[PDB]
């Protein structure tokens, strides 16, 4: 009913789920999925614009939580918040 509370609560719950619940499964499935072409990654094959950025990925968090993860779970938080905030006044939607 109050957006400034609903959005904060939804974002907090999504971040908690990301950092403490599904962290291991995501970080172990990611290691097995690296795009490649003819047995070599895109940057190894010659694409100079396919280099993986290194500055933004490092973090001092104990488990490796970073900014990209922050944005990935924060987006889910805002989307779910505005889903609940819309089917309250009058919304008959899935």
């Amino acid at each position: 009913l109050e957006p400034s509370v609903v959005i904060s609560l939804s974002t907090g719950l999504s971040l908690v789920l990301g950092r403490f619940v599904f962290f291991n499964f995501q970080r172990e499935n990611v290691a097995k999925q690296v795009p490649a072409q003819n047995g070599k990654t895109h940057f190894d094959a010659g694409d100079v614009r396919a280099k993986e950025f290194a500055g933004i990925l490092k973090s001092n968090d104990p488990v490796g939580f970073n900014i990209v993860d922050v944005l990935a779970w924060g987006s889910i938080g805002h989307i779910v918040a505005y889903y609940i905030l819309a089917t309250t006044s009058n919304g008959y939607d899935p």
């Binding site: 999925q33 072409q37 094959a45 694409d47 280099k51 993986e52 950025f53």
Partner: protein, 733 residues
């Protein structure tokens, strides 16, 4: 690099006229050019795509400029049901005075052409109102067309050429094209609808000089940020609204009404806005699936390598398909062309039943033209898909790296596949032709009560499920007390049900036994065309009659008269045979559409319902009856405005027939004849002082097949277009 063509030494040393023809025909086959590498192929393709964009922008800008300069858009805006829009002026010095008088129409001061493309309705629905707006649009498109050429020139210089590994980054391209090209474009168009077109449909004029001050909504973006989105729907337009005016206007921008606008007989604008907003959201979400540089995203190769049925019935599954697809451009072109053909047909089917442009539903000739045009384009695209798919098997397919996956097993059970397709075609042909002939005989002997008339019960049942009440079925949306009826009872069911049960529009037309028969004929066409193309593709690499076919390439004349004779054995020839069946099938589809609608618009449905069950009905009541005006465009007593169409009609019949000459008579007859003419010229005084420099020869075998099929297709199209336009516009305008 010696002479034309510079890209082929084999053609450049040819001393005959064959050098010129073939030089034109292989210009855009970059893979076959001398000393070509993999990287230059991609770079040249990129430049050519920029060229296509420049040409498209020029075409659209020309349309806008000519309409603004010589049209009656402003006059048409005020009386859209009785004024005929103007395409462009006519300046022909061959004209006589009666033609000058006859072609002066639409309120113009000179002879003109009437437009049937529907651009007036389209441009009026999106908020354009004056000739100045059209001029600015044409100039802007002229700027974009120049931008395309400049970019194409720039990306072809050594400093600015992308590398080969750039063109093969599949995940990044998919992300950018899903998120940005589809979703963000939809967002921008929704913004245009909210800021410009919807206000224009209420008497408010927003342009580039005042759009900042005016608010699209009285309460602004407050409801969006706070989440009270339902405020954007609560005051929709009235049922007595006049489209260009403020009488009955509302204030909503996003609705879920359904049905049609009672005056314009088209979809509500707020529904289109909400639609594009939701679609934009879906694409924006879809575009985050794949991994580029940030440690998140799926991998396509790893997705393919995993989905393998553990029972072993699909061999090794999808293992190895990533490289097979990503290293072959023909595979990619085939997938893209197939998808585009399917959606071209879907566009054609959905634009006649659910019109989106104001006052276009009443313009019968325009609707007919659009449906026919897009169905023929779809047919050509569908044939091309299988053509480039067959090219894949010869040029790029590598057996060793596809061992025991689905693609190899397709080649493994080709006999079973082809035989079952043949059985389906035989069954449909035998029993459909038999029923038609039985009904014809019953009509001839004067006993119409002995016909075989099968009611299309399944389709009527589905129509009842969608809300139609004609057939007395009580199921789903046609029932009053059910979960499906209750769930949508307040959202969109009222307008939808009002639209479906109105029998003046073309939303779920009433159907009968004639519809049953013609639908099974259309199914026959689809199955047989697919048989021809699939047999071409799967036998491309070889068969029992020619086990080493892949060494000879995609297109070659034959393998000689030995082993029984081998005429028309290549895959190119299978494509050539399939194009005829494609034209046949699309002809059946468009004939059926046109006759059903022409009897709908005259208020005489029983004519179709009774004459369509036997073939003499089609010949007499559709073809013969609807030609009478067309063939009187000019006669011994004078001419009228249909004369051009009448002329075009005959033009078509000519080109068609000329094609027969190339298809029936073959090369050896013509070469012997040509030798005699060469002898005659070399022996004639006052004329042997002139010499040829390319030795004349008869056309090649494959070239003749191509030229004959081209004359056939051009004649086909021009004849039907003349008949359709003349027959409809003579009755309705």
């Amino acid at each position: 690099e010696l002479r034309f063509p510079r890209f082929s030494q084999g053609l450049a040393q040819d001393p005959t006229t064959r050098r010129i023809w073939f030089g034109i025909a292989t210009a855009h086959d970059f893979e076959s050019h001398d000393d070509i590498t993999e990287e230059r192929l991609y770079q040249n393709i990129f430049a050519s795509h920029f060229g296509q964009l420049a040409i498209i922008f020029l075409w659209t800008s020309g349309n806008l400029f000519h309409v603004a300069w010589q049209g009656n858009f402003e006059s048409w805006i005020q009386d859209p049901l009785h004024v005929r829009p103007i395409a462009h002026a006519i300046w022909d010095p061959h004209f006589g005075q009666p033609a000058v008088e006859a072609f002066t129409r639409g309120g113009a001061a000179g002879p003109v052409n009437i437009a049937y493309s529907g651009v007036y309705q389209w441009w009026y629905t999106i908020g354009l109102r004056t000739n100045e707006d059209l001029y600015t649009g044409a100039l802007f498109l002229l700027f974009l067309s120049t931008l395309s050429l400049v970019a194409g020139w720039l990306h072809l210089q050594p400093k600015w050429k992308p590398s080969l590994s750039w063109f093969k980054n599949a995940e990044s391209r998919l992300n950018h094209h899903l998120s940005g090209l589809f979703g963000v474009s939809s967002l921008a168009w929704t913004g245009h609808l909210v800021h410009v077109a919807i206000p224009a449909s209420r008497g408010e004029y927003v342009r580039w000089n005042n759009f900042l001050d005016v608010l699209p909504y009285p309460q602004g973006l407050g409801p969006l940020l706070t989440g009270q989105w339902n405020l954007y729907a609560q005051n929709p337009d009235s049922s007595n609204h006049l489209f260009g005016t403020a009488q009955g206007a509302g204030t909503a921008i996003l609705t879920l009404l359904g049905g049609f606008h009672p005056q314009t007989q088209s979809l509500w604008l707020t529904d289109i806005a909400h639609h594009h907003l939701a679609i934009a959201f879906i694409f924006l979400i879809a575009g985050h699936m794949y991994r580029t540089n940030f440690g998140i995203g799926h991998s396509i190769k790893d997705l393919l390598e995993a989905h393998t049925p553990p029972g072993g019935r699909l061999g090794r599954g999808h293992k190895g398909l990533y490289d097979t697809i990503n290293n072959s451009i023909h595979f990619q072109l085939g997938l893209a062309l197939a998808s585009l053909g399917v959606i071209t047909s879907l566009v054609a089917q959905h634009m006649y039943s659910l019109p989106a442009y104001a006052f276009i539903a009443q313009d019968f000739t325009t609707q007919a033209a659009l449906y026919t045009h897009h169905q023929y384009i779809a047919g050509f695209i569908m044939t091309g898909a299988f053509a480039h798919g067959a090219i894949f098997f010869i040029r790029d397919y590598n057996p060793e790296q596809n061992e025991d996956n689905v693609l190899a097993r397709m080649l493994d059970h080709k006999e079973a596949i082809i035989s079952h397709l043949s059985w389906a075609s035989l069954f449909l042909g035998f029993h459909t032709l038999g029923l038609y002939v039985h009904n014809d005989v019953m009509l001839a002997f004067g006993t119409p009560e002995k016909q075989i008339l099968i009611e299309p019960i399944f389709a009527q049942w589905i129509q009842s499920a969608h809300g139609k009440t004609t057939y007395g079925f009580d199921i789903l949306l046609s029932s009053t007390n059910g979960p499906a009826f209750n769930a949508g009872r307040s959202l969109w069911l009222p307008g939808w049900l009002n639209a479906v049960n109105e029998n003046s529009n073309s939303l779920f037309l009433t159907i009968g036994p004639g519809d049953f028969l013609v639908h099974h004929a259309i199914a026959l066409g689809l199955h047989t065309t697919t048989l021809i193309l699939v047999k071409g593709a799967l036998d491309a690499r070889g068969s029992k009659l020619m086990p080493d076919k892949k060494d000879f390439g995609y297109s070659f004349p034959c393998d000689g008269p030995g082993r029984g004779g081998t005429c028309d054995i290549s895959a190119w020839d299978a494509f050539y045979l399939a194009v005829f069946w494609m034209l046949n099938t699309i002809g059946w589809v468009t004939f059926y559409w046109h006759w059903k609608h022409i009897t709908l618009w005259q208020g005489n449905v029983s004519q179709f319902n009774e004459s369509s069950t036997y073939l003499m009905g089609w010949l007499r009541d559709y073809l013969w009856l609807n030609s009478s005006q067309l063939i009187n465009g000019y006669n011994p007593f004078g001419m009228n405005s249909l004369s051009v169409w009448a002329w075009m009609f005959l033009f078509g019949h000519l080109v068609w027939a000329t094609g027969f000459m190339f298809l029936i008579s073959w090369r050896g007859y013509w070469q012997e004849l040509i030798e005699t003419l060469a002898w005659a010229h070399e022996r004639t005084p006052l004329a042997n002082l002139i010499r040829w420099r390319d030795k004349p020869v008869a056309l090649s075998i494959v070239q003749a097949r191509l030229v004959g099929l081209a004359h056939f297709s051009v004649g086909y199209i021009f004849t039907y277009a003349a008949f359709l336009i003349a027959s409809t516009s003579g009755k309705f305008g």
